[PDB]
Amino acid sequence: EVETFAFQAEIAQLMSLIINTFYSNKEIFLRELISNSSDALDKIRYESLTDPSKLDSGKELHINLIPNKQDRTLTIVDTGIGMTKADLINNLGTIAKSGTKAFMEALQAGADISMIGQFGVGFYSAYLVAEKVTVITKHNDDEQYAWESSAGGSFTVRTDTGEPMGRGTKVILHLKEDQTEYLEERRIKEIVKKHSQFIGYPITLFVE
Amino acid sequence: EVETFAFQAEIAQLMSLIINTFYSNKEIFLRELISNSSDALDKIRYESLTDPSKLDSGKELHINLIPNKQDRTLTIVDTGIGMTKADLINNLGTIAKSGTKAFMEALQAGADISMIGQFGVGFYSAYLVAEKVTVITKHNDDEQYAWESSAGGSFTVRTDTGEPMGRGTKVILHLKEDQTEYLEERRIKEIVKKHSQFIGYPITLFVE
Numbered sequence A, B: 001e002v003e004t005f006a007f008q009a010e011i012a013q014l015m016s017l018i019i020n021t022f023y024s025n026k027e028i029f030l031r032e033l034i035s036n037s038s039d040a041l042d043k044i045r046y047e048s049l050t051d052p053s054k055l056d057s058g059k060e061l062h063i064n065l066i067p068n069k070q071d072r073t074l075t076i077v078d079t080g081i082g083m084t085k086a087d088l089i090n091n092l093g094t095i096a097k098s099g100t101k102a103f104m105e106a107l108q109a110g111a112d113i114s115m116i117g118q119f120g121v122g123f124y125s126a127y128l129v130a131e132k133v134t135v136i137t138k139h140n141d142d143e144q145y146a147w148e149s150s151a152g153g154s155f156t157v158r159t160d161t162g163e164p165m166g167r168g169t170k171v172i173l174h175l176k177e178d179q180t181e182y183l184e185e186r187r188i189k190e191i192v193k194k195h196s197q198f199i200g201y202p203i204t205l206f207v208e
């Protein structure tokens, strides 16, 4: 059973801005997603200090970047804390509401799209390069979910009956036709070195 | 009753590096503490979405910067999530252990002290300007604590029987004799504008 939801108006407006604005420095999407993964990993690590059973879903704390030319996807995988159904449907959108407003105000004040991460909505920079984003996530004490959106004001959530992940988040970027450079090893390696050099977790770039 | 603890060796080593290294761009301490406050405020806001009773200790989410020439202090106050006794004594030091190692490696690799925030140990940049740091903190379901350190490898924690805060953290910087510029309105305002322009909470700079 697939449920369809409308984004909050402000989020839909943000996504359209991201999709519509002429902005060539698209590569910043990768720094934002890795930064989200790092935050998610910081969260599970912190929580495991007071409750060590939280690592029973997996002890290794890392980030994998997986390009697939056959499927035209770049997947960012982490073993961070994961997201609950409420995160996916309600909670994150509520945080995203005030961030969006500030960001859209800052852009009019002369800021640029690369600063999106300072407003807590960097996940949406995925839409710089992806026609569709699929997010597979698994939080302790909740089921595994698949969230999906090709923008246009709506997203879906289903209970994921695919392959179990243990704990964490996979962001699958279905790349736009003209954005397949982000499937190239040299290109990803360049970007990670330029913007994500000091992340406190191993980042493995998979090869094809 | 005041308890005295030793920092972990790596943290003590970090503090000595911060205190000893010739480094003129000391003003970055303020961006790091405001960033910590913003993170703490993000935390309480997020948690209150699933448990609204968490805001019974105070709904207003903000940052105050309070200079006091008489006491030679600059205080950074937030109404974020606050810290537990275990945070103060154990948990934060455990996170700080891996961050320190990476940071001290990056510095040898050619990085500079301003990048300290990317390694999760930015709190310690307080020692660029402060001879002593006093932290008053109050987390829901725990008592109010005072943490204190003038470095030298040890810190203290006591149950705080001073004035109740409701919920959040006050970082009181007892400034070094030659660092009283950070008590000046123009100077603080300049620094906040330069480095903390897009924080998602009101930051009130108090006057004297």
Ligand SMILES: CCCc1nc2ccccc2c2nc(N)nn12
Pocket (backbone or CB within 6 Å): A036, A083, A088, A092, A093, A095, A096, A120, A121, A122, A123, A135, A147
């Ligand atoms: C968890 C932080 C990254 C993240 N992941 C998502 C996944 C699905 C839907 C929305 C989001 C989402 N909204 C915001 N503001 N951040 N965010």
Ligand SMILES: CCCc1nc2ccccc2c2nc(N)nn12
Pocket (backbone or CB within 6 Å): B036, B083, B088, B092, B093, B095, B096, B120, B121, B122, B123, B135, B147
């Ligand atoms: C809560 C994040 C800021 C913070 N506050 C403290 C207060 C007292 C002792 C240690 C810390 C501390 N250690 C680290 N790594 N961050 N941190």
